[PDB]
DNA sequence: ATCGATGTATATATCTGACACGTGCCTGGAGACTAGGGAGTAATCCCCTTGGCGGTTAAAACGCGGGGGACAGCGCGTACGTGCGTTTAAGCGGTGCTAGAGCTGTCTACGACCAATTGAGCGGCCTCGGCACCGGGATTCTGAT
DNA sequence: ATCAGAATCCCGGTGCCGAGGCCGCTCAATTGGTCGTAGACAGCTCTAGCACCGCTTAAACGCACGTACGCGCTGTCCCCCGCGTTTTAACCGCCAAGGGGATTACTCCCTAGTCTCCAGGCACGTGTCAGATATATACATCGAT
């Protein structure tokens, strides 16, 4: 295997991540395994978000993940929602949630 | 004549997870910004961890404890598992 | 005239404006408001159209996330109507000015 | 009170003076004048087809423009305002 | 061409709609003025930093990256506008 | 052992906060809130510590943990 | 020195060493540590001046953390700068809600 | 017998400037110390973000100035910018 | 409670702009060497944490009675919602101008780097004051009288 | 009002310890001097921002009316508060053990830097299908009747 990404079994670019860690001035040096690890973590997080979003899309019987579906995936999952609590998502809308007192009797 | 992004890598991950679900353009912009956000967060935390210890290099140890500091519980555990798995494989053979 | 009992149209409008996602503040007046606010900082600025749209997205997100907390405060006081004391309590708890 | 450096303000004059464009409020701006001067010099020396005359990059204001002819000649062009009026009050006990 | 008093572009039904999205079932009549004040304060606090990032870049055009950077600074990260 | 945060101590914290009259269930709720906050902060402190390959949570670790929560704390050699 | 050259009291040399060995950028303009040392000294003079006065009100000739908290929280634009900062042994601003006062 | 850095004597000198008779207790010393560290880390972090945002490799006084204008609130910002400009200008005035 | 009809949700047919895909170039990723400095590891010092204890005393815990504040119910008036008709100005398209973003070459000032050196700063040490406090006196609170 | 019983505030002598001042030394800041390059300046190009007009038409406005709901008022009760008494465990000072932090010396291997390929990725361009809407249809449901 030539490229470090395929050598690490990932899909995110280990090389691009290595460059961004170098010309980002986070430290004088960047260990060999740091880009591998960081790209693996990025890949896992984006795989989780895309999985949940795809499910949210399959719910509404659509085929394309629009931003609405990313918002539903993020908000409707406690751990992502804690990771992305201070994050507006353009066109995201809001979770459909009427307060329990406002509904008529 | 180039512009960097993750617009194709996120698409590969998608096709690997949901083999038949496309992703819109604005949603691709969102994911492309989410990856950048998490990258800057984990990298900034690893930089803080490099200075707080008077180290100089961002090893994998630094990225690991940075992932433990940022992501909440089960995301942290799974992300650390994936990271160590990818690192170990890279070290192997 | 035929009429639903008050509250019903408000309920269906809540349903409808929580399903959809289109921007709610009318666009052109918001562009004008942004330019008018920016004049006090650097005269003759030009606003990338997408920058104005980003400001509008952020502002609608903030007002929606403020009316959520306002509604929480109002219901906490055994009311259904939100009122300026609710908004001021929400913004005082959040930490804003 | 430096006795040598002055601000220049145009007095009343009926026939419009073509240096109006270079005003910054009531002061004649050295910067804008220099800018127009150098732009004119550059565009004119680009009309020199069979001789490489090069305008040297900005360094100050007193050596307004420095031109290089071929590979041996250098010419310093300094722009100066002329006043027919009395020598400034401060500069009397000299000469 | 100066503009003045466009805070009344955030009309009454626009704020009513924003509320209805927020879940509000019944809005008092003095919410409109307080909401316009709140919106103007927030917009000033964001556009000041947008314009500052601009001026520091020596540009004369507020890019969307400047607005996104301003929001990220205020602590309200925005996703979906490059960078 | 959370009960070490006695009823009068929560009362004193509320006094300092300006609370005039305290209900009876505020005590259990406040013990819960405090335990949550301490869980988060000590988790981050122990993370920084483990990463430094030490075994004594030092003041700088807790200062950093609080800074990371967004509650910067002046006064401990920051 | 180099802090005396700028009429500062904060050490421009130390702020240079910290901007350089802190990995904030590859290069550090030689006019940056001066500007930064000046801004730090101005904010420290502001804090210490408001603090001092409060101590003098408490008829005391020695600032203690309580006085720093009183200065930082009474001033409106120092509060906004340190809005998310707790000061050790700082106490709070004497403030009883007007509804709780007797009637 | 190492050399741990801290802004003790500096904050002390600024104090003796602004209150020639008021001392400062070791705990308030530590607080002023952590305040200097916090503000300096904020300003340098924002200067770094400015530099990287505009693809520059130097933190010049321009970046520190915009960092101050971003962090410190309004009046504090204006007065701090003035103080820094004055200090830097004075530094240029020497050699 | 049926209408009913308003509204919501379900089903199919059509259009079209957005996307998923197939190339061509290029530049950034990858690989092989070299070198040196950062990090690991072992040894040693000594500080600083932990534990144990005995006593004292301030604080916690407990009982109790009573009053004052929480909470529910009712009434009343206003003020907010809803529907219609009229007015306004957003949105869209289309054109047209151009101010300014963006890329590129040149060149000079400026900052990194290194070696010498010299004073500023840190640490140990010690003397004085400043704060806490105790006590006595005086004024001002809260509450029954 | 008043009178009292504390609570608080003022003023002064007093002790303790911690802060402020001094001195010695080592190490980092300063100063030249050299070199490389970042960035500034200008100049060209063309994208994109602004301005404006005219139409259509959806939304905003204004107004009228009714009723739901906010709010004040009253009544009851339970549940905090405040106080006095008994208990308990925190503080403190002291001492001992020893674990681990911090430092130093040595060595090695891991990463930066550089140069040399070359394929992964991006912009371009294109074909098509997912989704929005139209039209038609089945059913929930709000509600005054």
3-state SS track over chain C:
CCCCCCCHHHHHHHHHHHHCCCCCCCHHHHHHHHHHHHHCCCCCCEECHHHHHHHHHHHHHHHHHHHHHHHHHHHHCCCCEECHHHHHHHHHHHCCC
Chain A interface includes B19 (CB < 8 A): no
Which residue of chain C comes nearest to G84, CA vs CA?
Answer: C95
Strands D65-69, D53-55: pairing is antiparallel
Q: Cβ of C29 under 8 Å from any chain G Cβ?
A: no
Q: Which helix (H) or strand (E) holds A88?
A: strand A88-89
Q: Give me the residue from E22, E23, E77 closest to A88, CB to CB.
A: E77
- Report the 10 Å Cβ neighbour count for G39: 29
Residue F72: strand pairing partners:
none
Name the CATH topology of B1-93: Histone, subunit A (1.10.20)
| Residue H16, both tokens | 């003796």
CA distance C51 to D31: 34
Q: Pick G6's closest partner by Cβ from H71, H75, H87.
A: H87
Q: Which residues sit opposite G65 in a β-bridge?
A: none
Residues 6 or more apart whose CB falls under 8 angstroms from that of E7 comprise: C33, E36, E39, E40
HSE-CB of E82 using CA atoms within 13 angstroms: 12
The closest alpha carbon to H88, from G78, G41, G21, belongs to G41
Chain B residue at shortest CA distance from F68: B69
Torsion C77-C79-C80-C81 (CA) sign = negative
Q: Could you give the count of Cα atoms lying within 13 Å of A67 in the half-sphere of its Cβ?
A: 22
Cα four-point dihedral sign F63, F69, F74, G2: positive
Tokens of residue B18, six digits: 């949901």
- The CATH classification number of C1-97 equals 1.10.20.10
Which token pair is E55?
Answer: 């001026």
Q: B54 and chain G: CB distance < 8 Å anywhere?
A: no
Say if CB H33 and CB H8 are below 8 A apart. yes
Neighbours of A36 (CB within 10 A): 29
Q: Report the residue count for chain F.
A: 78
Residue pair C50/E65 in contact by the 8 Å Cβ criterion: no
Classify the phi-psi angles of C54: left when phi > 0, otherwise alpha if psi is within -120 to 50, otherwise beta: alpha
| Token pair 């004549």: residue | B1
Phi, psi of D53 (to 5 degrees): -105, 120
Cα H14–H15–H21 angle (5° rounding)? 140
Identify whether the C-beta of residue C69 lies closer than 8 Å to the C-beta of residue C96: no
Residue in chain G closest to C96 (alpha carbons) equals G80
Q: CA angle at residue D39 from D35 to D40, to 5 degrees? A: 120
Q: Quick check: G64 and H7 in contact, CB under 8 A? A: no
Contacts of H63 in chain E (CB under 8 A): 56
Give the torsion sign (CA, B55, B58, B64, B65): positive
Phi-psi region at D28: left, alpha or beta (left = phi > 0; alpha = psi -120 to 50): beta
- Best to test chain F binding among G88, G94, G96, G99 (most F CBs inside 10 Å): G88
Instruction: State both tokens at A104.
Output: 């008529």
Short-list E75, E25, E6, E22, CA closest to E45: E75
Residue nearest to nucleotide I107 (CA to C1'): D57
Is the distance from CB of H19 to CB of G48 less than 8 angstroms?
yes
User: Tokens standing for D19?
Assistant: 């240096």
CA of F8 to C1' of I60 (A): 8
Phi then psi for residue E5, to 5 deg, are: 60, 65
- State which approach was used to obtain the coordinates: cryo-EM
F30 touches chain B (CB under 8 A): no
User: What is the DSSP secondary structure assignment for residue A11, as one 8-state letter?
Assistant: S
What is the tally of structural domains in chain E? Answer: 1
Is D76 a known ligand-binding residue?
A: yes
Distances (CA, A) of D92 to B81, C40, D5, D9, D88: 87, 49, 15, 21, 7
Q: Per the structure block, which two tokens stand in for E34?
A: 């307080």
The domain segmentation of chain H, as residue ranges, is 1-95
User: 3-class SS at G55?
Assistant: helix
Whole domain around residue E20: which residue ranges? 1-83
CATH number of H1-95: 1.10.20.10
The separation, in Å, between residue H78 CA and nucleotide J137 C1' comes to: 68
Q: CA torsion sign, H67 to H73 to H74 to H75?
A: negative
């Amino acid at each position: 295997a030539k490229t470090r990404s395929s050598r690490a079994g990932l899909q995110f670019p280990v090389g691009r991540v290595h460059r961004l860690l170098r010309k980002g001035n986070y430290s004088e040096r960047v260990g060999a395994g740091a880009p591998v690890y960081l790209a693996a973590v990025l890949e896992y997080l984006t795989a989780e978000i895309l999985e949940l979003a795809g499910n949210a899309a399959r719910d509404n019987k659509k085929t394309r993940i629009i931003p609405r579906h990313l918002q539903l995936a993020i908000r409707n999952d406690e751990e992502l929602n804690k990771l992305l609590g201070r994050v507006t998502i353009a066109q995201g809308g809001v979770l459909p949630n009427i307060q329990a007192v406002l509904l008529p009797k | 004549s180039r512009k960097e992004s993750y617009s194709i890598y996120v698409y590969k991950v998608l096709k690997q997870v949901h083999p038949d679900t496309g992703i819109s353009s604005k949603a691709m912009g969102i994911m492309n910004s989410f990856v950048n956000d998490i990258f800057e967060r984990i990298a900034g935390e690893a930089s803080r961890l490099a200075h707080y210890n008077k180290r100089s290099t961002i090893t994998s140890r630094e990225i690991q404890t940075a992932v433990r500091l940022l992501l909440p519980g089960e995301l942290a555990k799974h992300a650390v598992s994936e990271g160590t798995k990818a690192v170990t494989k890279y070290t192997s053979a | 005239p035929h009429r639903y009992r008050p509250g019903t149209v408000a309920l269906r409008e809540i349903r409808r404006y929580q399903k959809s996602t289109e921007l709610l503040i009318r666009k052109l007046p918001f562009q004008r408001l942004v330019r008018e606010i920016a004049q006090d900082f650097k005269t003759d600025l030009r606003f990338q159209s997408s920058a104005v749209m980003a400001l509008q997205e952020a502002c609608e997100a903030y007002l929606v996330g403020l009316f959520e907390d306002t509604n929480l405060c109002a219901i906490h006081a055994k009311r259904v109507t939100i009122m300026p004391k609710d908004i001021q309590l929400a913004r005082r708890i959040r930490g804003e000015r | 009170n430096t006795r040598a450096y002055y601000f220049v303000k145009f007095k009343r004059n009926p026939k419009e003076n073509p240096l109006s464009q270079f005003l910054e409020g009531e002061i004649l701006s050295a910067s804008k004048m220099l800018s127009k001067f150098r732009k004119i010099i550059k565009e004119e020396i680009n009309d020199i087809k069979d001789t490489d005359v090069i305008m040297k990059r900005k360094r100050g204001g007193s050596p307004a423009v420095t031109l290089l002819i071929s590979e041996k000649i250098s010419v310093d062009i300094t722009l100066a305002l002329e006043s027919k009026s009395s020598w400034p009050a401060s500069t009397q006990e000299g000469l | 061409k100066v503009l003045r008093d466009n805070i009344q572009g955030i009309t009454k039904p626009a704020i009513r709609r924003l509320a209805r999205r927020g879940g509000v079932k019944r809005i008092s009549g003095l919410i409109y003025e307080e909401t316009r004040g709140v919106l103007k304060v927030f917009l000033e606090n964001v556009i000041r930093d947008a314009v500052t990032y601009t001026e520091h870049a020596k540009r004369k055009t507020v890019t969307a990256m400047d607005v996104v950077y301003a929001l990220k600074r205020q602590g309200r990260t925005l996703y979906g506008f490059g960078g």
